[PDB]
Symmetry: D2
């Protein structure tokens, strides 16, 4: 029994604590550890309950979504809910997925820079790419290599592998594919040393200009027009005040702070709340939060508010990892995107990415209105 | 709980799959603590598996670190890093700075006027007046410094202050409002555009946080004996150093990273933050870290490692730390709540634990990448 | 008419005969507006060929500014020896660079490779909605879409060959980065004309599209930008060399170990602490600037052309020798057009054997010059790093 | 006694070509001879034909500005103006080989002049040097950092630093740790000099003093790239380096129409989408402008500044807004936090460059208010950049 195994572990742990009675408030009973153990967590001593609230309906692409948000930050859900209301009263939001492809960026080294330059040229030919793709794609049915971006630093060569991965976030799958392609590359260049399967050129879980500029995972754009009456009555401000704050805070302020990818008010709050509720990798909030929020006067009198959010690097999935646990599957089902999209692999993950971008836009609208109105 | 059950009933009627909520738990949870403080429109809670890594031998003390995660092998890998550190005599850490920030943006009619306000804020009399207004909002709010930046007629003011054992965003924002109200008495022509002009910078990647710090700045170090590198980490000191330089330094530089000179600090920070009731969205800046390794000892075979994190945003009082399950994890570490005798000591100790655990995580993953053990 | 008579008619190159006199009159007129009338006394203007300058390189000309030119070399690069001209007013720069060349020469020379070649222009256009700009982005990503744009782009010149497109969306805005070869010219003018033509063609397919600016800062030209560092701009070059232990000791006055420790902690860790993007070197900008001024390049392009990462490591059977490499992804350079049309700067290009067009292999002179710049930067890095390591200031 | 004899003697493996001047009794002759020696090593011996070398005062250059001199490179100098700034009019010299740069800048000055002029302010002044030192352990480096942050520690360091020059005044110390490494950014005024030499000397003295209190400390490099000098860096953009300046102006609607050939609305739309959004898409730190580097570079070459410093000196954010009764006037401002400039020392010691500094009325030291000539020049650069931004933006907006 897994539940008793966790029980004993807590007893064994209890003796090493200065306050052994602390564990009494950490839950562990009535939980399915079958799905957890050997797949999601080790040395398990219980679980941490995170409150889940709902924001919506989010009117996006002619559909209505009830968005689950796991958070301990007061007013986050209520504020986001107000943004959804403004969007709904304005006829809804529209979104588009611009790119899709998870990456892995290993670093290999050759004896000389002249050699790494030779390897770079070969990878850039249609023939070089084709053989590397064949080796990469042979690891899984969903791993389809789309492109390579190679960069050198002397005798070092950084290779950014970008690939589709069905409805999965893709890290494991893309990593397995990269290992096989690097092995194949080694057969063509025996003098090549594989330094690390990840040379930080992906880039995974670290802020990086490469993710902002080339994208990682899903690149999405969302937009909406909020009528002047709605800006006044629901957001309690004016279109002019919203625009002035957007330019001076999200553009100029972020520029003064030396930000790369942080041209928004609080995309990270929304991304994180949705990620925790839906079994995503919350640590990926680092790059997934990249966003530029733009606002413009619209309509016959420049009284309406046009808003758009562009997020080039949303790392998300509806199969694998934490999405295999039942409570998180319930949240994915709420959105209608749980598991693989059998009819068209990747569609569930793309829909979830659009929902994230649309919810972020609702969050931006609400916070900006509050800052503008005081 | 009855209101929650009813909200769930109403919500289920708007879903494409009315049974979605079946596996989303909600019973046997105390919502009196959540309602009106941590979350709104509550429909239940999301259980995140909690594992333990340790003991972490830090500053002559041993810690059992709780980590909430759904990523397989993260806890086990971190645990291996702790083992290597423990076998090497432990780690040492130091808090270099402490101060949460808020960076509002105000505007004057002309750039010549904003320059005038700036010179004023830089005199001892100007700062004393602002500090008096700022510090009157709370017993624990003490303004340490001001950093101002001009962009034409706009002026960005970065207020930095201690906040006891609280993360401090609320306290600092209140003090900022009072200080600005006071500044407006001296400059009636000044317009307060937004209490946050993204110059803080909160929840967005920013060079200012990396360079000037935000929250707690911490450094930690350890020396791993050659025999431990071989037997516990399964690699050599030379392989570790080569990977650190080419991945964490050169690779991050090729990717255009600001503050991402590490392997996976974000994973550790996020896991600890969720378990301990911190703001997980703050993982964006809190994850900033530079990992350095070098050879030491009699024969240059031992491994010296250090991790420097200039912007850990953390607290042991307020927000999610008011909930019982998260207090249990803080108690496990011996840092729950306020430190009555020396305000801020519990928060500082938690920051040191985070930096030491990150270092354990870096050691383990780097060894795996170096040895080619995936 | 006398000078005093021409002045009263004013209260020039087309009016007066010779150019030197036009400049002389302009100087006399300007003098009146000066609080110190004799300011221009030491600003030379005589014996200079203004015919190549007027209506091409500068306007409202009042003379010329002499910049001292020194020579560093021989630079042993790719089995050839170069005598590098450097225009500078900074003491010890030429001597220091010369020392670096010596170390490289004593070590058997340096090797270099051009990894990429393509100047860029990044305009910004707008559509009524983001859903529309997304459609345009998708259209440009098709083989047929790119085919038509390339056709329009390429028709503007024999040397204009569009290699690729990189598009980025920001709401209803679309930034398009055009990249193309340009023979031996730096290519900004050629690429800008091709861009204009390609955008007109694009407008035929999407009439609702507004061309906001031919340059939307997505190029990026003369501003520090991560896009140039990551995707390159102009010529991307890498050079390397191995300096024998004996040479490090006797010529550079230090040790391989001290050099490596300084490189890692200054060029890597220090630049990381400073929040630098592309500045992982000691002083590439000094060399780039000195060569650019001497060879008629656009000195303002030093901003991105200076991007460089310098790496050092122990080498040889005993790990005693010094391996060094410099990688510069965005060298914006040319041997035809602009300042390279002036005689004194052509003299410096001729010294290097790269002046003008390479009729046999277009672009070869510009590529060779880029390799020389990267090799000279490496010589400069070696020398300054050795000085910092040994403490010889 | 003859060039041919001297050359034969040199070729007899006795003297390197660089120490020619220390043997001949005339600088110009050493140059002439070095050219002849260089000629025989070129694939094309006549290449030096059009590179001038005669009628130039090499006494100021040798041993101070350049070595192995073979001549000089003439850069055309044009004038843009008058630039109406702070109730004064300036005639700005610009050395460039880029067509239309001077004419375009001149058009921007005209628009500014017709609008009543520009206003500017110097917000900060202080050159920096950022050495890197190492302690045995990170716990030791943390200790040095805490010590430097005390009033006593700073006082001791300031005393050693300031003793190098009367113009040197250590304003602050920004330290950052990376494990056992400690980066210390020294910032100080330097009179009218750009200050790199003075600040480096003071840094060396301060580090020697610090080493007396921490003998375990190793000085790795007087410059650890934390200055940061001649490399793009967020620290310069955020904390400033040299002079931080802001300038502004209001261009009347009629002037935007008639002189700039566009509208206020078109200019604002281009500024936001190019200088703000475009630069953000490109991942720029400090490059929120159209072409500040062109103006900075042209002025720097003409005035004897260090042109390689264009890297950080060109940092600039250009902002435009609708202003006036009907929101048709154009308000513009340029903010440059890191202008590295000086009116004494280096290239400013040469006569032709002093002529350009005199044209602006800022040549040499300001006798009655040290640093005032350098500050005035920084304001001129920022105002000229603003004129350049106005003109190019109008051209891009109008098509
Ligand atoms: C409940 C929440 C949406 N939320 C936050 C605060 C949100 C923070 O987490 C992120 C924010 O710091 C990002 C930024 O704007 O830089 C604020 C708020 C923000 C800035 C401020 F100065 C004072 C209060 C706020 C105000 C009204 C309603 C909800 C609010
Ligand atoms: C369980 C975990 C510690 N964890 C991760 C992978 C961890 C990732 O989340 C972060 C990582 O992506 C950061 C980076 O290094 O860029 C890997 C791993 C990492 C990179 C790779 F190519 C293959 C496997 C790994 C290997 C062995 C044991 C644990 C591991
Ligand atoms: C003649 C020159 C090559 N050059 C420079 C100084 C070079 C500077 O322009 C760039 C440098 O500042 C870049 C950097 O290192 O960050 C120095 C020098 C550098 C730092 C120092 F503290 C003192 C002197 C130097 C020393 C010996 C020989 C030539 C030198
Ligand atoms: C003479 C000059 C003022 N100058 C330049 C070109 C200026 C370039 O050096 C810098 C520019 O590239 C910076 C940028 O905006 O990214 C252009 C120009 C600029 C961009 C373009 F697509 C076409 C022409 C231009 C147009 C009219 C008048 C002068 C101009
Ligand atoms: N529609 C789908 N999209 C992606 N993966 C799918 C799908 N259906 C099934 N799978 C399988 O589930 C796995 C995805 O989870 P996992 O292996 O943990 O990798 P990842 O880290 O990408 O989530 C793959 O082994 C794949 O074969
Ligand atoms: N005035 C100078 N002009 C050009 N190069 C110089 C000059 N002084 C020194 N050098 C360069 O520096 C190298 C070092 O010479 P020097 O400083 O005399 O030291 P050492 O002779 O002890 O090696 C020389 O080989 C030369 O390349
Ligand atoms: N205003 C100034 N700013 C910077 N350096 C200055 C200034 N005035 C003088 N100097 C420096 O001091 C040197 C000598 O001038 P100064 O100190 O005034 O003494 P003196 O009495 O010999 O003129 C000059 O060569 C220059 O380097």
């Amino acid at each position: 029994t897994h539940e008793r195994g966790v029980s004993i572990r807590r007893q064994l742990l209890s003796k090493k604590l200065s306050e052994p009675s602390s564990l009494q408030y950490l839950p562990y009973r009535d939980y399915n550890y079958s799905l957890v153990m050997g797949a999601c967590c080790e040395n398990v001593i219980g679980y941490m309950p995170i409150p889940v609230g709902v924001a919506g309906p989010l009117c996006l692409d002619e559909k209505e979504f009830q968005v689950p948000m796991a958070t301990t930050e007061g007013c986050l859900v209520a504020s986001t809910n107000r943004g959804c209301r403004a969007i709904g009263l304005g006829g809804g939001a529209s979104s588009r997925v611009l790119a899709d492809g998870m990456t892995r960026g290993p670093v290999v080294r050759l004896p000389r820079a002249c050699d790494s330059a030779e390897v770079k040229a070969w990878l850039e030919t249609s023939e070089g790419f084709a053989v590397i793709k064949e080796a990469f794609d042979s690891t899984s049915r969903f791993a389809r290599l789309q492109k390579l971006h190679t960069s050198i630093a002397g005798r070092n060569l950084y290779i950014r592998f970008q690939s589709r991965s069905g409805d999965a976030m893709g890290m494991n799958m893309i990593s397995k594919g990269t290992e096989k392609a690097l092995s194949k590359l080694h057969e063509y260049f025996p003098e090549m040393q594989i330094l690390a399967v990840s040379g930080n050129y992906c880039t995974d879980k670290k802020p990086a200009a490469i993710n902002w500029i080339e994208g990682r995972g899903k690149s999405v754009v969302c937009e909406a027009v909020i009528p002047a009456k709605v800006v006044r009555e629901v957001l309690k401000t004016t279109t002019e005040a919203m625009i002035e704050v957007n330019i001076n805070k999200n553009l100029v302020g972020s520029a003064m702070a030396g930000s790369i990818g942080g041209y928004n008010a609080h995309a990270a709050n929304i991304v994180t709340a949705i990620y925790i509720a839906c079994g995503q990798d919350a640590a990926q909030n680092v790059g997934s939060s990249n966003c530029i929020t733009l606002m413009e006067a619209s309509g016959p009198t420049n009284e309406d508010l046009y808003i758009s959010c562009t997020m080039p690097s949303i790392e998300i999935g509806t199969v694998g990892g934490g999405t295999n646990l039942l409570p998180q599957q319930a949240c994915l089902q709420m959105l209608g995107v749980q598991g693989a999209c059998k009819d068209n692999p990747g569609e569930n993950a793309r829909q979830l990415a659009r929902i994230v971008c649309g919810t972020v836009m609702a969050g931006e609208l609400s916070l900006m209105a509050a800052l503008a109105a005081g």
